[PDB]
Amino acid sequence: TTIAGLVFQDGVILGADTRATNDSVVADKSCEKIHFIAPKIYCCGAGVAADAEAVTQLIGSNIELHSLYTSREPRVVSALQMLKQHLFKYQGHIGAYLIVAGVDPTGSHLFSIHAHGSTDVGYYLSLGSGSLAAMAVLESHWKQDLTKEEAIKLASDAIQAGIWNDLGSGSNVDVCVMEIGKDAEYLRNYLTPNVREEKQKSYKFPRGTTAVLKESIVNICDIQEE
Amino acid sequence: TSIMAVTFKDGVILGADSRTTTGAYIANRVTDKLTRVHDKIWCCRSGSAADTQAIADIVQYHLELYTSQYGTPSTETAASVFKELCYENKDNLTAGIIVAGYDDKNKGEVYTIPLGGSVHKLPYAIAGSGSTFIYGYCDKNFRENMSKEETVDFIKHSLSQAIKWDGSSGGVIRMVVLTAAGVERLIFYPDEYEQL
Amino acid sequence: GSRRYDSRTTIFSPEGRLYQVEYALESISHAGTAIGIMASDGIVLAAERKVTSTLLEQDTSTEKLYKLNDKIAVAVAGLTADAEILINTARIHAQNYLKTYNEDIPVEILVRRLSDIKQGYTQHGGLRPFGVSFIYAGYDDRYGYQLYTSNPSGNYTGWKAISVGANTSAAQTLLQMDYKDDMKVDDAIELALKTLSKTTDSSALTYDRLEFATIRKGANDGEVYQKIFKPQEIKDILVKTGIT
Amino acid sequence: TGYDLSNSVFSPDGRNFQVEYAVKAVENGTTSIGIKCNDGVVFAVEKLITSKLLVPQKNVKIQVVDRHIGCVYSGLIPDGRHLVNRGREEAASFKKLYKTPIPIPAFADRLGQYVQAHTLYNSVRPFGVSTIFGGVDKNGAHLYMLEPSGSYWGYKGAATGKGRQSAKAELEKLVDHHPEGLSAREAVKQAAKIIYLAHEDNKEKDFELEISWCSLSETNGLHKFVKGDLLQEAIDFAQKEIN
Amino acid sequence: MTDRYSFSLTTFSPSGKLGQIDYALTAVKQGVTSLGIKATNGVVIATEKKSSSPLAMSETLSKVSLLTPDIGAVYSGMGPDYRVLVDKSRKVAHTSYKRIYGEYPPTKLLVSEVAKIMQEATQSGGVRPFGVSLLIAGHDEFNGFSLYQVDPSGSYFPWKATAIGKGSVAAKTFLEKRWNDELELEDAIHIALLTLKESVEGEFNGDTIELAIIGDENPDLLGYTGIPTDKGPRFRKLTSQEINDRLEAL
Amino acid sequence: NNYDGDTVTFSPTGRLFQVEYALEAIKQGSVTVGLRSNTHAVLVALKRNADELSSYQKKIIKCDEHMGLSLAGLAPDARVLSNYLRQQCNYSSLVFNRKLAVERAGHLLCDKAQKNTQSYGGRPYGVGLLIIGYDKSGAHLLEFQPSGNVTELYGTAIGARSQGAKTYLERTLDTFIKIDGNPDELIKAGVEAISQSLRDESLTVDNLSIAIVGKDTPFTIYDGEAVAKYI
Amino acid sequence: GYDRHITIFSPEGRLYQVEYAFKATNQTNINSLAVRGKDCTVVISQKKVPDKLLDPTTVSYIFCISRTIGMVVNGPIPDARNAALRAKAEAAEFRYKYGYDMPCDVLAKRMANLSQIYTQRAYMRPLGVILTFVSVDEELGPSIYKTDPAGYYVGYKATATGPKQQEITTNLENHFKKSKIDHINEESWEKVVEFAITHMIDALGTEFSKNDLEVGVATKDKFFTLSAENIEERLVAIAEQ
Amino acid sequence: SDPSSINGGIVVAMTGKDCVAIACDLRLGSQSLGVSNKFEKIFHYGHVFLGITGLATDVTTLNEMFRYKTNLYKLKEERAIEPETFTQLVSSSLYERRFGPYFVGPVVAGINSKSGKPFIAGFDLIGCIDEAKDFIVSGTASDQLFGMCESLYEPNLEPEDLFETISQALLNAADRDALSGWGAVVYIIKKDEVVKRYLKMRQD
Numbered sequence A: 001t002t003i004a005g006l007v008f009q010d011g012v013i014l015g016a017d018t019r020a021t022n023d024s025v026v027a028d029k030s031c032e033k034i035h036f037i038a039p040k041i042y043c044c045g046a047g048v049a050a051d052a053e054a055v056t057q058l059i060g061s062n063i064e065l066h067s068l069y070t071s072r073e074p075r076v077v078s079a080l081q082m083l084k085q086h087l088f089k090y091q092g093h094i095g096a097y098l099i100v101a102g103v104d105p106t107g108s109h110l111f112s113i114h115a116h117g118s119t120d121v122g123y124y125l126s127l128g129s130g131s132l133a134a135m136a137v138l139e140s141h142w143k144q145d146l147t148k149e150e151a152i153k154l155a156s157d158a159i160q161a162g163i164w165n166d167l168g169s170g171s172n173v174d175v176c177v178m179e180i181g182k183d184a185e186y187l188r189n190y191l192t193p194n195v196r197e198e199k200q201k202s203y204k205f206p207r208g209t210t211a212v213l214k215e216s217i218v219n220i221c222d223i224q225e226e
Numbered sequence B: 001t002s003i004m005a006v007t008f009k010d011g012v013i014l015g016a017d018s019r020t021t022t023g024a025y026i027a028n029r030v031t032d033k034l035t036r037v038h039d040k041i042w043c044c045r046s047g048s049a050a051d052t053q054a055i056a057d058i059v060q061y062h063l064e065l066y067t068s069q070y071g072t073p074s075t076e077t078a079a080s081v082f083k084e085l086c087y088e089n090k091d092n093l094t095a096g097i098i099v100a101g102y103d104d105k106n107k108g109e110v111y112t113i114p115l116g117g118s119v120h121k122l123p124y125a126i127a128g129s130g131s132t133f134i135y136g137y138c139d140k141n142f143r144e145n146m147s148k149e150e151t152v153d154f155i156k157h158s159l160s161q162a163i164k165w166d167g168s169s170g171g172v173i174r175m176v177v178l179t180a181a182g183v184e185r186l187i188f189y190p191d192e193y194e195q196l
Numbered sequence C: 001g002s003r004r005y006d007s008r009t010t011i012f013s014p015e016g017r018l019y020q021v022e023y024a025l026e027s028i029s030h031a032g033t034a035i036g037i038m039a040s041d042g043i044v045l046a047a048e049r050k051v052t053s054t055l056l057e058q059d060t061s062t063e064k065l066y067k068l069n070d071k072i073a074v075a076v077a078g079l080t081a082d083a084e085i086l087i088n089t090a091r092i093h094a095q096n097y098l099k100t101y102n103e104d105i106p107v108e109i110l111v112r113r114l115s116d117i118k119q120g121y122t123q124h125g126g127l128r129p130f131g132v133s134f135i136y137a138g139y140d141d142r143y144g145y146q147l148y149t150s151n152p153s154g155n156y157t158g159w160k161a162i163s164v165g166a167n168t169s170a171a172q173t174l175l176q177m178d179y180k181d182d183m184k185v186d187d188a189i190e191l192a193l194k195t196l197s198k199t200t201d202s203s204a205l206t207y208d209r210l211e212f213a214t215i216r217k218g219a220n221d222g223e224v225y226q227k228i229f230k231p232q233e234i235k236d237i238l239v240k241t242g243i244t
Numbered sequence D: 001t002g003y004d005l006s007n008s009v010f011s012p013d014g015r016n017f018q019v020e021y022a023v024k025a026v027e028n029g030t031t032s033i034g035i036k037c038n039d040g041v042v043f044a045v046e047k048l049i050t051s052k053l054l055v056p057q058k059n060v061k062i063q064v065v066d067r068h069i070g071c072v073y074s075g076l077i078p079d080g081r082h083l084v085n086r087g088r089e090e091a092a093s094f095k096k097l098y099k100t101p102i103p104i105p106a107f108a109d110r111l112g113q114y115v116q117a118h119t120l121y122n123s124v125r126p127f128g129v130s131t132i133f134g135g136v137d138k139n140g141a142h143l144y145m146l147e148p149s150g151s152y153w154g155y156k157g158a159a160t161g162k163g164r165q166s167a168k169a170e171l172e173k174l175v176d177h178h179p180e181g182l183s184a185r186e187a188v189k190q191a192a193k194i195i196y197l198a199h200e201d202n203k204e205k206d207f208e209l210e211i212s213w214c215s216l217s218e219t220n221g222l223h224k225f226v227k228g229d230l231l232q233e234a235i236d237f238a239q240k241e242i243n
Numbered sequence E: 001m002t003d004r005y006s007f008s009l010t011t012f013s014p015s016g017k018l019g020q021i022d023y024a025l026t027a028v029k030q031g032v033t034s035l036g037i038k039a040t041n042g043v044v045i046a047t048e049k050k051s052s053s054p055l056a057m058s059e060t061l062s063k064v065s066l067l068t069p070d071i072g073a074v075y076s077g078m079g080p081d082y083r084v085l086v087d088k089s090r091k092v093a094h095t096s097y098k099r100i101y102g103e104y105p106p107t108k109l110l111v112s113e114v115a116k117i118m119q120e121a122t123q124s125g126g127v128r129p130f131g132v133s134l135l136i137a138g139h140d141e142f143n144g145f146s147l148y149q150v151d152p153s154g155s156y157f158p159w160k161a162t163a164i165g166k167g168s169v170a171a172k173t174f175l176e177k178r179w180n181d182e183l184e185l186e187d188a189i190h191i192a193l194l195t196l197k198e199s200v201e202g203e204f205n206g207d208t209i210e211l212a213i214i215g216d217e218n219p220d221l222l223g224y225t226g227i228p229t230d231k232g233p234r235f236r237k238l239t240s241q242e243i244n245d246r247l248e249a250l
Numbered sequence F: 001n002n003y004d005g006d007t008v009t010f011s012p013t014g015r016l017f018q019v020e021y022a023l024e025a026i027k028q029g030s031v032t033v034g035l036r037s038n039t040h041a042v043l044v045a046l047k048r049n050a051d052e053l054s055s056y057q058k059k060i061i062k063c064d065e066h067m068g069l070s071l072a073g074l075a076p077d078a079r080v081l082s083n084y085l086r087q088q089c090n091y092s093s094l095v096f097n098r099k100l101a102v103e104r105a106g107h108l109l110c111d112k113a114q115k116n117t118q119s120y121g122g123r124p125y126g127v128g129l130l131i132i133g134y135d136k137s138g139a140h141l142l143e144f145q146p147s148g149n150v151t152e153l154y155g156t157a158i159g160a161r162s163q164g165a166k167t168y169l170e171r172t173l174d175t176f177i178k179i180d181g182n183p184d185e186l187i188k189a190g191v192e193a194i195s196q197s198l199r200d201e202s203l204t205v206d207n208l209s210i211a212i213v214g215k216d217t218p219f220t221i222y223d224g225e226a227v228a229k230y231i
Numbered sequence G: 001g002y003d004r005h006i007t008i009f010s011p012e013g014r015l016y017q018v019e020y021a022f023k024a025t026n027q028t029n030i031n032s033l034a035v036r037g038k039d040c041t042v043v044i045s046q047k048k049v050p051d052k053l054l055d056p057t058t059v060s061y062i063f064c065i066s067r068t069i070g071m072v073v074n075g076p077i078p079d080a081r082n083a084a085l086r087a088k089a090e091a092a093e094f095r096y097k098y099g100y101d102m103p104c105d106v107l108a109k110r111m112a113n114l115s116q117i118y119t120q121r122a123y124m125r126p127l128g129v130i131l132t133f134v135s136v137d138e139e140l141g142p143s144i145y146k147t148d149p150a151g152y153y154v155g156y157k158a159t160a161t162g163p164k165q166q167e168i169t170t171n172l173e174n175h176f177k178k179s180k181i182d183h184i185n186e187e188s189w190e191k192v193v194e195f196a197i198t199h200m201i202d203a204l205g206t207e208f209s210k211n212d213l214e215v216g217v218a219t220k221d222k223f224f225t226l227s228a229e230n231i232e233e234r235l236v237a238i239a240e241q
Numbered sequence H: 001s002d003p004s005s006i007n008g009g010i011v012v013a014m015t016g017k018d019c020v021a022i023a024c025d026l027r028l029g030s031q032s033l034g035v036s037n038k039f040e041k042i043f044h045y046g047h048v049f050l051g052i053t054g055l056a057t058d059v060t061t062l063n064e065m066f067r068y069k070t071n072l073y074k075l076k077e078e079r080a081i082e083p084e085t086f087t088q089l090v091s092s093s094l095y096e097r098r099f100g101p102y103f104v105g106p107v108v109a110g111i112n113s114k115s116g117k118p119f120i121a122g123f124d125l126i127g128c129i130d131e132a133k134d135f136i137v138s139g140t141a142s143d144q145l146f147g148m149c150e151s152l153y154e155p156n157l158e159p160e161d162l163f164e165t166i167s168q169a170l171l172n173a174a175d176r177d178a179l180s181g182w183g184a185v186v187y188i189i190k191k192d193e194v195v196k197r198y199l200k201m202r203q204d
C-alpha cells in the first residue's frame, strides 16, 4: 500500500493506490483505501485491510451520531481522538495505519494514526509499504502555499512513486480533495497507468468441451404454488 | 529522543529534539515532544509515543477537572497524577516523562518520572536515548538560578550534543519557556545548533 | 422504600386467581375478534381490525396476522406492541431449533416456549403480564394441521375451531353449531367470515376491516403455503361467500 | 398528604419533609460550635454528663479527618461518625491521587455531595446531623457547617444543636466587636464561654467541655485537642464570665 | 442509593385498562397539533412551534427531527420525552441495522425499533410510558414512501394522512375531505398548511411553523461528490422563507 | 405511628421508631451488670430460663484473650456482633501483631450498628452489649446500644430492672473503682449490684454468670459451681 | 394519591413531582438574569447574605463549569452543586473523548436529558433547580441555554429566572422590541454588565450595593465571575449617568 | 495444523452478460486422507448464492448462521435479501469474530432482483470485501484459480460460454492441487432461472 496526504493553500488532499495483497498475490486490483468518515473528513488506510475498513466505519458511524446530537459539523480532531483511543485500547492488534484529513469549522487538518494509538501532525505524510517511495517524492517537491493543481500533482506523484517502485503497491491512484468552503471531491481512479494490455489469444472454449455428469434446475423462488 | 527540563531564576524551560524513529527510519522529523497538560504545566515525553500520548491526554483531563473544582493545580499535583498512571500500569507502559511547571509561589519546578513510575524532583532533568551522551556535559555546565538566555544556551548546547551522537535524536530543537510573563515557544534549526 | 408503590403483579387472590391475568383477559375481551378454523386440507385465520378509519393505509398494515416461520402463523388479540415482543422471540426460537436440528420446529414446541414465557411473567419478576392472546395456525410432518391458543396465564390448548378477543362466547357457539370434522378450507373460510359477520359490533363487515390468512398443503407438489390475504383478495372472498 | 412518609418526595410546597424531620433530630442534640480565628479554627462541644458513671475525657466527640481537618456535630452521633468515615475515605483518595492534603472547600463539597445524595432516594434516610468542620489549608483557615439537606456555607462563626440561638447571638457579638480578627488562643477561651452560655438550654444535667483547634502558628496547621492547662484556662475563663 | 423499582408501574386495572398508557395519551391530547400527509412522490410532516417565550429562540428547538437521511419524525406531547426518543432512534438505526447491513433501515423497521423502546417503558420495572405520540415519515427503496404513527403503548399504524394532539379530531376530518391517492408533494404541503391553520390561534408564518418533507434525493445537501450510488438525503426541512412563499398561494 | 414501618423513616419530631423498638427488646431482656477498677473489669449476668426443664440462656461471650461482652435482648444478634468483634480482634492480631483497643472495638460496633439504621430492608440490631476488656491503657467497660451509641463507663447495667443496679453502682462508684489487685472483691460488688435488680427470684448456682478480665487475667467465664463462691 | 409522590402520570397527564420541583426552584427567593452582547454573555444574580456569621465570599449560585462555560442556578444549593459537579464532569469527559471543548448548548442538552431521566425513572427525584448555561461559543457566538426539572431546554436571546422573573422578562421583552436585535449592541462586556444591572434595577424596583449582586461574564475562551470591587466600579458608572 | 488447508477445497465465481456463475469442488479430507466426495461448498438464501472454502466445520456453521439470519431478515423486511446487502452481512458477521475468526474464504454470487445487475464478492477470514467485476477465487488452489481465471476470463460471456470458462478454470486448477477435486459443481445463475451442473473430473 501507498497512501499519502498533504496540505495546500486552502485545503488538504489525500492519495492512495488501489492494490490489496494477500502475501505475494494480488487479491484486489481496484480497492478503495480512502475511507469515508464524514462529508468533509476522509481517512486513508494501510495495514490489515479489514481493520482499517472496520475502524473507519465504526468511528464514521459514531461521528454521524455525534454530529446529529450536537447539531454541528464533525471535526477532524474528533475523528482523530476517537480513532486513536480505539486503536490504543487494542494495543496494535487492530493493525490499521491511517492518514486522516478533513475540513471543519476550525479549518483544514492532516493527521496520521498508527495501530498502537500514536498520532502525528504534518503538512505531508505517507504510510504503508510504499511510504518511503512516496516520502522521497514529497521531501523533494513539497513547499508551502501549494495551489490545488500543484497539490493534486504532488499527491498523485507521491502515490505513483509507490506504485512503480513498491511491490506492495500497484494499479491505480485514488485522490480526495478537501478544500475550505467547498464540497469535498472524491476522485476514484484519478490515474489509470496500469491497464492490462490486450491478450494475444481468446481462450473462449468450444461449447461442450467440458464433460458433464448431471444437470438440474434449482428452485430459488419462494413457494411453487397451486 | 533527547529531552530536558531546566529550572532557572524566572521559572523553567523544557527542551526537546523533534525526531521520531521506527527503527532506523525517521517516521516524523518535526515531532513536538513538549506537551501541555495545563496552562503552565508541561511535560517532555520519551518512550512509547502511543503510551506517553495516552497518559498525557488522561493527565490533561484530570487537571482540567481538578481546575473546575479546586482551581489551579500545583506542578507537584500534576507530577503525582503522571506518577499514579505510570506506576499502577508499569507492566503495560514504556513511558519516561519529565514534568515541568511554573507556580508563582513555588516558581520553576521539574519532576522526572522514569520507567518504574518513581518520582524525582530535581533542579534539572535529562531523559530519552540521547541523554546518555550529555550526563557529563550537563553536570559540568549546569548552575542554579541562571538567566533565561544562559538556560536557553545550556539546553541548546546540551541537546546539540545529544543530537550529534544519538541517531534516534535529531531535527529541530524545540523549547518552551514557563515564567510569570507567560508561555513562550522557541525553535532552533540544524544550521544554528550544529555549528556550536 | 419502594415497597409502598408495588402493585404485586404475581399474587393469588383469596379465591386462587391471578389478578393481573384475569384483568389482562378482560383487556383482551375488548380487542377485535380473531377466529381460527382447522380443516382436513388447511387452516383458516380470520380477524377483525379494531380502528376503522378511512385514512388508515390498510395494504401495508399488520395488527392481527403475523408470520412466525414458513409453516406457522399467529392471530393476535390484545396489545399489539406486547404481541410483537413475543412474536420476535417466537421467530428466533424457530430459527434456533432449525439451526440446531436442521429441521423446522414442530408447532407445539414453539407454542409451549411462548406459553412458558408468558407463564414466567405471572409467577416471578414483579412485572405485568403480556396482554395478548394468540391463535397459532401451523403445520408439521408429525401432527399435520394444528390450531392452538395461548393467553396471558401461559396456558395453551389445541382446537379444531376457536375464537379470541371480543364476543368469544357468541362466536364459539356459532362455530360449535356449524363446524364438522370432514370440512374443507373453502367451507372454513366461509364459516370464519359468517361468524365474524354476526358477532361484529360494527354495522357491517367490510374488506378494510379484516385481516385474513390461510395455511394450505395445496401448494405445488405437496408443500405448505402460507397466504396472508391482500385487501383486494379479502374483498373478493367477501363477495364470493355473499356477505357484501 | 403522605408527602412526609418517604424521603426524596417533594411536597406541594417544594419541600422534602424527611430532611426537615432530620433537622428536628439535630435540634434535639447537644450544642456544638465553630469559631474561625486569624490563622485557624476552633471547635467546641457540649457533652451531657447523663450519669456519674461516664468516664471523664473518654467519650470523645470531636473527630479528626486527615491530619489538618476537625469535625464536630450535633444530632444522631452514629450518623456523624458514618459521615466522618466517608470524609476520611474522600481525604485519603484525594491525597493518594493529587499528593497535597485535601483543601477545606474541596473537603466540604465531598461531604456536601454525599449528604445530598441521601436526599435523592426513598431507600435511604437523610443524615440526622449538622456537621461543623474546618481547618487550615494552603489558602488559610476555613470554617464550614453542613446540614441534613447537603446545604453548607463558609462561616465566621457556626453553631448547631439545642443551644444554637444562644450561641449564635454570642458569635454575632464577637464578629461585630472583632472585625480585624480573633487570635487562636482567644477563640479557645471564647469557645469555652459560648458552650457554657449555651448550656442554659440543657441546664438540667451538668456537662463536660471539649475543645479542639487547628492554627498555623499554634499547632503548625494540624488538628489538635485542647488538653491540660490550656483547657483548664478556658474553663476558668468561661466559669468567670457566667458568674 | 438503589433502584428498588424492579416492578411494573403500568398495570391492568379491573376494567382491563392500562391506566398509565391512557394517561400518557391524555398528555398527548394536551400537546400541540402535529400532522402528516403522504403524497405519491413524497411525505410531509408539520407542526406548530409553540414558543414558550418571545425571548426564546424557537429555531434552536427542533420539533421536526432527522432520524436517518430518508426518515424524519415529529411529535405531539412531552418535548423532552421526544428528544431522548430521537437520540435512541438515531442510534438504534446504526447499532441494530447500519453496522450490520451497511445501509439505513427502511421506515417500518426503524418505526418498529422505536415502538419497541416505547413498549418497554410500558412494561419494564420502575418507568412510566413515554408521553408522546410520534409521526414518522420516511422513504426506502423497496417500500417507497410511508407515514407511521407511534403511540405511548408501543402500537404503530401506517397512515395516508393523520393528525395527533390538540385539534386532531377536527384536523383528521379536514384531511379526510382533502386527501386522495393522486396528490403531488406540493399539493400535500398546501393541504398541510391549510389543516394546520385551523388549530393555530396566534401568528401563522414560517417562524411559528415547522415543516419537513421526505421527497426527492438532494445531492446538493450531501456535502461530497464522487460516488454515483449515494444521491443524498430525501429528508429536507423547509426554511422559514420557503414556508412563507407557499402561504401567499394559500 | 405512621413512621414506624421501617428504619429509614424519621418521625415528625426527629425520632427513629424502629431503633426505639429495638431498644425496647433490651429492656425485655434479662439483667446484666458491668463494672471495673483500674486493674480488672467484671461482667455479671442474670441468665434466664424458659421453664424448670430448660437450660439458662448464656449471656456472656468471649471475643479475645483480653476482651469479651455480655448481652441483653436478641441473642442471635449478639452472636452476629460478637462474631464481628472476634474477627476484628483477630485481624488486629494477625496483621499488626496488636491487641485491639477496647475503645476502638466500641467504635467498630457503633459503625456496624449504624449502617442498619440508615438503609432500607435491614433492621436495627435488637440487643444491648456490655463490653469489658484490658488493653494497653488498662481496664475498660463499654455500653453498646443498637442505635449505635457506645459509651465508656466505670460501671453500668442493661436489661429489665437494670435501674436498681445502676443506682447502686452510682453510689458505690468511689468504692469499687479502688478495688485494685483483688478480683474476688470486684466480683462481689458486681454480684451485690445485680442483686438490686432482682424481684421474687434470687441468685442460684445455674442462674448466675460471671466473667472477668484484668492485668494478669485472661477473659474467663465462670458458670455453675464456679460461681457458688459468690452466692 | 401516590401519583403525586413519584414520577408517574396523574389522570390529567401531569407529573406532579416535576411541578413541585419547579416550586422548589424559587425557595431561595433569588432572581437571575442573562443577556448577550456582541462579544460576550453576561449573567447577573441577586446575592442575599441574611446571616452576619456567613462568609459572604462562599455564598454563590454562579459556577465555572469549564473555561468557556458558566452556569447560574435558581434553586437550593445542594441540588445546584449536584448539577454543577455533574456538568463539570460531563464537560471534561467530552473534551477528552471528542478532542474539543464542550459547547454550551450541548452541555445544556446533556443536563436536560439527565433531568428527563429523573421525570421518567421513579427511584430518582428531579433536581429542584433551573440551570442557566452561558458562553461565547466558538461556532454559535454568545449563547444562553436554560434547563429545568422537566428536562426542557431552549436557547435564549436573553432570559430571567426566579420569583419575579415575569417582571424582568417583560422589561427585557420591551427593550428588544425597541432595538429590534437579538443582543445588546455594545463592544465592551463592562457596559453589557451595566445594562444587565440597570434593567434589573428598573424591573425589580430596588437599588443594589456591591454585595447585593453577583456577576458572571463569558468572553471568547474564558468565563469569569466579577469581584465585589469589579461590581462596585460597574455600580459607580450606572449612577454617574 | 493450518486450519484453512486441513479439509481442502475451492470456490470460484465469475460474472457474465446478465448472469453469474459460481462453482466448487466436492472434496472433504483430513489432510492426505480423502473422506467425502459429496461435500458441496455452495449454498443459497433465496437468490443470493454463497460459496465457502476453508475449515469444513466453519463452512457448515456459517451456512447455518446465514440461513438463520436471512430467514429473520425476510420475515422482518418482507422480501428476500439482495447480494449487496448480504455481502455486508457476511462482512459484519466475520469481523465480529475478529480475534477468533472462522477459518473460511467466502464468496457471494447473485443477481440483484431490482436492478438486474450481476454481482460477485469475496472475503478474507475476517470480512474484508473484495468486490470484483471479473471473478473471485477462494480455497487451497486459489493461486491456480487466479492463474486460470486471469488468462481464461473475458468480460460479457453468455451463460453457456461462461459455464465452459468457469468449469475449465476450476477443473485445471483442482488437478494441480492435492487437496481439491473429487468432483465439482457449477451453478449458472440468471435473473429467474438457475441451472446446476455436476462435472466429470479425474478422481485422484
Ligand SMILES: *[C@@H](CS(C)(=O)=O)[C@H](Cc1ccc(CN)cc1)NC(=O)CNC(=O)[C@H](CC(C)C)NC(=O)[C@H](Cc1ccccc1)N=[N+]=[N-]
Pocket: A001, A002, A019, A020, A021, A022, A023, A027, A031, A032, A033, A045, A046, A047, A048, A049, A050, A052, A053, A128, A129, A130, A168, A169, H123, H124, H125, H126, H128, H129, H130
Ligand atoms: C496495503 C497495506 S500494506 C501491506 O501495509 O502495504 C493494503 C491496505 C488496504 C487494502 C484494502 C483496503 C480495503 N478495505 C484497505 C486498506 N492492505 C493489504 O494489502 C492487506 N491485505 C489484507 O489484509 C488481506 C486482504 C484480503 C482482502 C486479501 N487480508 C489478509 O491477508 C488477512 C490478514 C490477517 C488474517 C488473520 C489475522 C490477522 C491478519 N488474512 N490472510 N491471509
Ligand SMILES: [Cl-]
Pocket: G109, G110, G113, G114
Ligand atoms: Cl444524553
Ligand SMILES: [Mg+2]
Pocket: B163, B164, B165, B166, B167, B168, B169, B170, B171
Ligand atoms: Mg542525529
Ligand SMILES: [Mg+2]
Pocket: G006, G007, G118, G119, G120, G121, G122, G123, G124, G125, G126
Ligand atoms: Mg422520579
Ligand SMILES: [Mg+2]
Pocket: H174, H175, H176, H177, H178, H179, H180, H181, H182, H204
Ligand atoms: Mg486433485
Ligand SMILES: [Mg+2]
Pocket: H034, H203, H204
Ligand atoms: Mg487423490
